Design a protein around this ligand. Sequence first.
Ligand SMILES: CCCCCCCCCCCC
Ligand SMILES: CCCCCCCCCCCC
Ligand SMILES: CCCCCCCCCCCC
Ligand SMILES: CCCCCCCCCCCC
Ligand SMILES: CCCCCCCCCCCC
Ligand SMILES: CCCCCCCCCCCC
Ligand SMILES: CCCCCCCCCCCC
Lengths: 266, 266, 266, 266, 266, 266, 266
Amino acid sequence: SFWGALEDPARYLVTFIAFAQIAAMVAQYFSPTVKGAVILSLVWFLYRWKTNVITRMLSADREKVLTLDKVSSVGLFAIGLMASAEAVGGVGGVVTAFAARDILGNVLSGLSMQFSRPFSMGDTIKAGSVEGQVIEMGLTTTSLLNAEKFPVLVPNSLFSSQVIVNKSRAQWRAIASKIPLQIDDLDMIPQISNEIKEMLRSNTKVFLGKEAPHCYLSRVEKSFAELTIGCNLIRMGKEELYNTQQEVLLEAVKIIKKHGVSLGTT
Amino acid sequence: SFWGALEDPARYLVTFIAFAQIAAMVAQYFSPTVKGAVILSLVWFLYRWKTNVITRMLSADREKVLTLDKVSSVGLFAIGLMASAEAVGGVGGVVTAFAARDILGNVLSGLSMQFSRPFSMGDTIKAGSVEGQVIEMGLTTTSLLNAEKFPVLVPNSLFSSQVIVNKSRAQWRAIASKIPLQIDDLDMIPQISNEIKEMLRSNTKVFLGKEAPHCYLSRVEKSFAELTIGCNLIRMGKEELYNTQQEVLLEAVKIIKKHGVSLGTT
Amino acid sequence: SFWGALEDPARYLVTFIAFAQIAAMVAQYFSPTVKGAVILSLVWFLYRWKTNVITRMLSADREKVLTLDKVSSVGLFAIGLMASAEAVGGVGGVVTAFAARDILGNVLSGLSMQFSRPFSMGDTIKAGSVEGQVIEMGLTTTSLLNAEKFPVLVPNSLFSSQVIVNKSRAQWRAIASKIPLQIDDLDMIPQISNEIKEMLRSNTKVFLGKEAPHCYLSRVEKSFAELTIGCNLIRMGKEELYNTQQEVLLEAVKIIKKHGVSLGTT
Amino acid sequence: SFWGALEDPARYLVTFIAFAQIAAMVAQYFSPTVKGAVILSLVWFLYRWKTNVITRMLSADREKVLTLDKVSSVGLFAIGLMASAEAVGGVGGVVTAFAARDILGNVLSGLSMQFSRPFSMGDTIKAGSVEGQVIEMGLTTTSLLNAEKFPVLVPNSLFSSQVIVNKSRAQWRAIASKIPLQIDDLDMIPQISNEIKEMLRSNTKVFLGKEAPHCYLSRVEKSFAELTIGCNLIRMGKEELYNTQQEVLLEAVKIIKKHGVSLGTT
Amino acid sequence: SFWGALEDPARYLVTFIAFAQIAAMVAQYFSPTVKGAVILSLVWFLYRWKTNVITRMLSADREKVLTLDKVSSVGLFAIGLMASAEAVGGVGGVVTAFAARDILGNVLSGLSMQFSRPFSMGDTIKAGSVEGQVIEMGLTTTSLLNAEKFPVLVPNSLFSSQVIVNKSRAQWRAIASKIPLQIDDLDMIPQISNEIKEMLRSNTKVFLGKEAPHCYLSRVEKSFAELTIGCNLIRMGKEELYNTQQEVLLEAVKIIKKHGVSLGTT
Amino acid sequence: SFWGALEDPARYLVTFIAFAQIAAMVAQYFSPTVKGAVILSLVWFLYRWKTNVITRMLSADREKVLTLDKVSSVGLFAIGLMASAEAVGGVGGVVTAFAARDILGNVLSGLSMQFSRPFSMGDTIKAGSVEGQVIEMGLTTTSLLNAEKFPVLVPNSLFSSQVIVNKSRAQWRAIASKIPLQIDDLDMIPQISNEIKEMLRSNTKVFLGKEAPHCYLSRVEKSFAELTIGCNLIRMGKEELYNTQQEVLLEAVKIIKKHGVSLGTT
Amino acid sequence: SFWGALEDPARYLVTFIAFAQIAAMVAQYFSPTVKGAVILSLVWFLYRWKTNVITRMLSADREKVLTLDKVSSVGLFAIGLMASAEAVGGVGGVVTAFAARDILGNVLSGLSMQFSRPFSMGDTIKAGSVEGQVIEMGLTTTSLLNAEKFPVLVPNSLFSSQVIVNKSRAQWRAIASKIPLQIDDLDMIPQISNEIKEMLRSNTKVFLGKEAPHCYLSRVEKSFAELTIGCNLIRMGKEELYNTQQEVLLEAVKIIKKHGVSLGTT
Ligand SMILES: CCCCCCCCCCCC
Ligand SMILES: CCCCCCCCCCCC
Ligand SMILES: CCCCCCCCCCCC
Ligand SMILES: CCCCCCCCCCCC
Ligand SMILES: CCCCCCCCCCCC
Ligand SMILES: CCCCCCCCCCCC
Ligand SMILES: CCCCCCCCCCCC
């Protein structure tokens, strides 16, 4: 524990200065480099000692310990580098470019979504890869609840120039289905279709505003046919939707078997 | 609530200045950094207090609250930074580059689509990933209505150099189908085909301007054949299209079974 | 309507100047910022009033209204910004770079396709994702007619360094097919094949210039075999092509069943 | 026709100068901007008149018309801009960068393929997405003939650092096949395999230079086995290849059924 | 061993200086280039000798050997280059850009995840490609335990602007299933469904807070139907979840077979 | 032939100077532009005449013709441009950047593969998309022979930082297989497995150095089981490998049927 | 051989200087360009002669020949260019950028993996596309042994910021399986499951530290059910793992058939 934590940086530092001595045999900056190497080996030893004593205390007010010794590790590394500067290289523009891009892109999208609102709290959305309910609109991250009701954490910058499908602002819904038929004489196929269309227009909870309900014949085969049925239902909840799907399917099968035509197999 | 909101930034700030005191033991900028740290801890405390009192009022004129305390959070952060400047780093060119790209790319595409019009209001389009009716042509976003009649919100810059299929400007439509046959003697296969082609040319609602209707034999098997049938119908609505598909399929099956040939199974 | 359109920017502007007053407590540019904020709130109010009165007139010479109030919205925003300049940020190089790229890339490809012609009007082409007839070669966009006879609008810059298959310049066509066989004694398999090859060489509408017609045995199984048949037909229209495919398939099946060999099932 | 072509740019130009008059109420460059707007409206009117009179003549020496009025459109736009300069923005470096990249990349690859020759005229190649015979090696574009004998037009820069499979320089070919077996007693499986290998070595048109012919047992099942057979044939034409495949398959099936073992089904 | 290690760089160096002598026949920098070539051949010989004597000792305190002779190889290369400088090219900005990007991006994301916590130790997360339990939150790398309980090592910069699904913060779970039915008379289909919904509401361990339990008819066929059943269960462990899934499925099948309806086959 | 080759550039040039005359009505550089236009029309005429007389000679020492008139076309274009310079735009840095990248990247990788050798002549390699034997290691391109024995031409820069699987340096091979079983009483399943493992250890040509041979039960079903069998064979040729696979499979089936257990079907 | 090697560059050079003579008719740099062209034609002739005499000696101490005439080719090209300089263009920064990126990225990752060790010699790892045992950790390349025991050669820079799954540091393993059931009365389904869970807890070689063993019902069908069984086994070798999988599966099937329930078919 303490043995190797003092052993390995010390032997590494004496190996380094023994290399630097013969490097000075053949850049005459000897004393500042050995002072920097001494303090940097000291800070490497202190870092190893610190992670050893924090894993000693974790073998016996929990998250505070982790954030504390993490910021203490980065601060001890910083004070080691500012002790090496006593006796920047150009990374600063790169890391402020990256941090400015990430943080300010997130807050910029978080405000542009606040002006030109693409959704509200409770809406079910789909934005590219993510999909679910909106449970928390935050400053840098939105929180969704996906199809398995797990909380997803989406950064705002993923809503910047993407398409957003808003499933909770629809005013009518489109439903469709296919019904296979075991019918040998297709001369009854028009009438049935017309009957099914009448069933879809005398029915409430359907929306005849834009598209008429359809029921047509999509493919044929030996002792086989297939009807494609579809309509627009009015705006309704997710339980009435399922009940209306089942009710429409059952009424269509009642009409089909009323004409003495059994169902087919796929 | 108020306890931790005053507790955590204060203990963090005294931890920070206690670190800075021993940082001054080994950059002699002490008093401005402690004044900036004091005001920044004050603004962190005020931010935590503000989100606590807005979630206190939300536990008892709704969207205005959310946009108000969001712009108040970003303004309180701004006034904290301009209090730190009293006692920019280069992010400004990056964020104006990003915002200029997003906003002006959207308005540029929104005008170039206004000059050289690729669609109009009500047209059914497909542009890459999106597809549906055009219900609102806006300044920065177009609004579509997809196949399930959900409102999609597309930014204009996604129409810049993409292919746009406009399904509402077609002047004729191409339909096709396959019919399986249970036929053992294929010597009747030409005549049937010719008959079906005659059915597709004496029929109205077909368009003989460019391509002749076809009905050929695509594959063969034991007690099995397959006809590929196709034609161009004239410009018509979406109900006449389905009825003409069903009518053409039924007439083709009438012709096939007229020659004493039953349908096959796949 | 008029209530909120005057209400929300006015209350937002007095909130902003009330923030700026305490911002001046702790940048001494007070009067120009309040004059700019006043005129920008005025232009936000005028924008909201203008969209309200255009949606008032749309609730009672249609496309002209939309292009007119769109260019009026962008011109009112421009005159608001040039009133703020009375009392550019660097976006101009970015937007002229983007617009120059889009517009001049389209016109550059539209001329390079005019010199070194890869297709003409009426040709059926395939260029990556798009495929169909060429119905309009324009200055910035080509117009195609796809397989469902919908007009596709392709920008010219998508033909810059892509492969272009030109299906209307072919001088011969390659056809092929597979025929399954229910044959138990394969000693008749060579002769049949030779017979089929003779059928493909005494036939007109085939092209013996480059490749001889082939008919070989690709796979075998219990009571099963498979022949792969293929040839090159001469340059012909799309109806003669289908009729020649059907004729070749029927002649091959006549030859196969002439040797007392029935077809197989897959 | 002439009505709207004079009507819309004139009303647009008087709308523009009426906007500019109140723009001069609150940049004192009035007379040059109104002179530029006048000439640019004049050139927009002339462009609309020119496309109207060319579509009038096309409603009554064809390709020359299209290239002529296209270069006349771009020259009329150029002379309009050089009339606006009488009373560049930086696009020139961008468009010469793009044109230099495209044109000189094509001619550079067209010469590097001429020095270090990866194929010749008539060779069947495959280079990434494209595949077929080489019918025309040009200065900027190669021309291939694909598997359906359509002429493909490939730019030379697509052969720059890609892998090129040259199917016409092979000196031997590798063939392989699988034969299913309905065999219950697998003790005859070695001998058969050895027999098949002898069939593949006493046969001419095979190449025993590098790899010995193989025939091994790849998988087993109830009343089922599978032999994998393979060899290298000598360099030959595409008809001898198919005949040798069929001959080898028939000889292998003769050997298998000689041992009183029938074929299996998959 | 020693033979070739002295042989090949020596013959290469005399080949090089013999080339340089005739290079000086037709840049008059002879003596520094031959001194640099001499020392660089010497360092190539020493590198080959060193890897030979370390692979000699590895053919007879293990990881220390590997890190030691690796840093000795790179230090011997460094001292060879600093001997060539006695008698930088611009790579330094590139490698500090790359190293600054990698290291500081990892530590930046490692701190931003420490402030705005997306998960804690023990949580099951999914972040793009990776998924599993969180067993070690480190300074530069997080450690997960995937579905096969292998330790995955993820760099922190992969959590920067990605969506993070946190499966351990869910407060209710959504379960669903499909049940096929062999039913010929569908008039019993509503009642059964209602019964199943009652079973899902009188049951404990379900969560009726947001969505009602559903059981509807999704598709129909000959002697076939399909019920889609679903509900929200309360927050529970991974064993109670499986037992509740099995219990709900068994109760649904008891209700279905109670009405004299057998199950169907797919 | 000669008619249009003199006709079209002459009429184009008089159209151009007639445009330039009215361009001089409203840049006073008249005489140099008309002299450049005259010589450039002359060089366009000479280019058309040259391709006509080379396609005249190709309608009657073949590859030399093509490389000769290609370099003559590019040299005639060069001498036309250097005649226009008598009475560079910045493309040179771009094309030398591109050519330097391509050529020197290929030669750089061709030397780095020569130092740190990843394969030799005759080795079977797989490097990303390419796979086959190495038949020619060149200066700028490697040549492989793929699985169908076609020569592939790979540029060296595709081996720069990719993974290279070298199938010809393996010292042992791993083989595995699955055997389905029709067994109803699984109490014989251990013994059989142990027997099969003994068969794989008393066998020569297997390698017991690292992994023991395994034979375990992977899945079960009605009248069905599945054994997964695997071992490491010693280094051997590609014929002994196939014979050892067949021999091991036959011995395993002998052991399985020795216990009175038949094979199963999938 | 020698004929064309002297013939083609000489005729090319006299063609070039004959072009340059008429180029001097209309840049007065004649004598240096003809001297450079003379020496460059001489070096092209010497290159062709050298590859001819090395392919002459290869038609009669092998790898040394190839590396020798390759470095001799590049040195002869270098001495030709330095003879042209007697009577750089800017490629040097590009090629040192590329070489510095490749070489120093590999050595940088090779040291960062040596400090913060993600695996050791002998560990089975998976890092993106590659997977296998670690047989050689080198300075610039790691060597793996994949699933077919082929040596893979991975550059170190592919381990820089990727996820590394280390399959040899696991302390317990997760196993799971599915068992289909032919059961008509599901009232025995709980008890069986409980029995199976007891079998998985009284068993040694399982790890009850974190997750309890589970056995639940995942899906149901006519005369069909499916159990999902799973547990965590303790750390063990790859043979004990397979034997424990088989043993657990056999014990589960013994428990299932003990209750008078046969297995089902999928
Ligand atoms: C102070 C912490 C915020 C910085 C985080 C930004 C992350 C940037 C690095 C990721 C890409 C290089
Ligand atoms: C004032 C709000 C508009 C700015 C939005 C632009 C978003 C830019 C960031 C996204 C990419 C970095
Ligand atoms: C005047 C309109 C033309 C400009 C359109 C160019 C679009 C550029 C923006 C798209 C990408 C940022
Ligand atoms: C003179 C015509 C040649 C120029 C064509 C180059 C096309 C460049 C634009 C495409 C990408 C922006
Ligand atoms: C002298 C010929 C060599 C140059 C070839 C380089 C090709 C560069 C162009 C491809 C990409 C733009
Ligand atoms: C001295 C050899 C080392 C250089 C190799 C680097 C390869 C760089 C070229 C690849 C990409 C352009
Ligand atoms: C001192 C070691 C740290 C440097 C590692 C950084 C790796 C950079 C190279 C990878 C991409 C070029």
